[PDB]
Paper text:
It is up-regulated in solid tumors, where it can inhibit the activity of PD-1+, tumor-infiltrating CD4+ and CD8+ T cells. Blockade of PD-L1 binding is an attractive strategy for restoring tumor-specific T-cell immunity.
Crystals of the PD-L1/atezolizumab complex were grown from 2 M ammonium sulfate in 0.1 M Tris pH7.0 and the structure of this complex was solved at 2.9Å resolution with a single complex assembly in the asymmetric unit. The binding site of atezolizumab on PD-L1 is mainly located on the front β-sheet which is constituted by strands A, G, F, C, and C’ of the IgV domain of PD-L1. The structure revealed that both heavy chain (VH) and light chain (VL) of atezolizumab interact with PD-L1. All three complementarity determining region (CDR) loops of VH of atezolizumab are involved while only CDR3 loop of VL forms interaction with PD-L1. Furthermore the side chain of M115 of strand F in PD-L1 is positioned along the hydrophobic patch formed by W33 (HCDR1), W50 (HCDR2) and W101 (HCDR3) of atezolizumab, while the adjacent Y123 of strand G packs with W101 (HCDR3) through π-π interaction. Overall, these extensive H-bonding and hydrophobic interactions result a total buried surface area of more than 2000 Å2 in PD-L1/atezolizumab binding interface, which is the largest among the known PD-L1/antibodies structures.
Numbering used by the authors:
A (entry chain L): 1 to 211
B (entry chain A): 18 to 44, 49 to 71, 84 to 132
C (entry chain H): 1 to 133, 140 to 192, 197 to 218
Amino acid sequence: DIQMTQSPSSLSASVGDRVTITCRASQDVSTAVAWYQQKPGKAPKLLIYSASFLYSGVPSRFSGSGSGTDFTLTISSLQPEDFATYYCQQYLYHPATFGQGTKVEIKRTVAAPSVFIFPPSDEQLKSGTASVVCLLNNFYPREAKVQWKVDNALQSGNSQESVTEQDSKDSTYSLSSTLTLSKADYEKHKVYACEVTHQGLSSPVTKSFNR
Amino acid sequence: AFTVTVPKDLYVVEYGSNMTIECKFPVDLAALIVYWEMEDKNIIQFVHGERARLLKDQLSLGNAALQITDVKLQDAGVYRCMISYGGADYKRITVKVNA
Amino acid sequence: EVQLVESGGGLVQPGGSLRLSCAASGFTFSDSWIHWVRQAPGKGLEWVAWISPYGGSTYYADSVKGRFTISADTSKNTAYLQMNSLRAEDTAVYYCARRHWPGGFDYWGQGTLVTVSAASTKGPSVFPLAPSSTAALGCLVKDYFPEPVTVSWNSGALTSGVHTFPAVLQSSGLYSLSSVVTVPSSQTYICNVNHKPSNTKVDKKVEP
């Protein structure tokens, strides 16, 4: 078919500065290319069509230019709600082909994580398992380390993390580790903690609970 | 935008005769798509450069010519052309069959 | 209010088949041009088919030609996509999308997740993550397959401060997901879970 190639593939930029997303084509098209804005869980929304023309109701800060092989989407003043994965797309040769994406993370200040925890429920303790969840709420940057300690013993091979997508307003993140144990193994240990570390925290926070 | 031009929208054609319907456009064959249709039926399907046919000659002149031969009462109806070289547009055309 | 409402997403076994609907309105469908664009989780976009409903003239992608067959009904005013002989590679979110004539695809569908796997279905178990006395609570959606899950709070009434996290795949082949919400420490809070494959709707209080 025909290949489309966005550069960079990822980028971090603060609010108010000019982003400039390039997208090149393997074949010498001319002018037949669009730009979309897919934000997590939702379908792509159109922004630009025919390289240099803005779609109806799109903010003026989004621009388009280029002819042939080389084009570029340009945001003049980036803003939290502009967090998304942008795509290019040529539509004169068919099959119509897309790029690979260009995730735009917003660069904000450092914000420490508010750490909460939740013990397992007796509902779940009738089933024969014990799940314990640790919540890191509204923090930045994305990178953060979490450890689980049972009776001060480091746990491993029984925890899973998941981190949300950058908030469209506050630009922060949130994470939820969840430690799973057997009931007959949860009931012999007493202490349970969530040892947390992050660029915003001076010393590792540890929220604990005893039965 | 990219728009289709028709010289006329109503053809009146004798039974047993021939007819050439036209959908003009501004002007790479590989990139060009042309379609001709009827209600829930397809006459032509032209994506990769290949009693009813097309005139590949006219395509160089920005013209989609639908040439039908031995017209039949069931050729009567509304035809619809759709074309695109990058941009795209569509036109509708009526055909009635005489005797 | 141009809307392309889709349906038919869910679990399918390899070799199996699935029919996706794409119901349209707010524009002349006969004069429209309907496409299909799929997107596996994490990957980009892939065009697979289009159709002209007025005549039903179709065009497929080499990936799907000889398997996927797109049809349409200009009367009932909805498109279709009969996927047959499916594979795990075909596991993705499929979007319906009408062509913006000057260029691009203007109006997209809400998207549906088709999952190709021989793994069975299982309804989730929903556990409350009881708060302790800003306050924070939630619901743990544990041991379910396949995706997706939809978790609400007070039936859409509670939007502020909510966080539903990306479900991760466990070693048991089953997904698990937690949804929480930062809430005034100073009401009746309920997590509304729904897993369509197992056809289970759960509404669970979260008491301190």
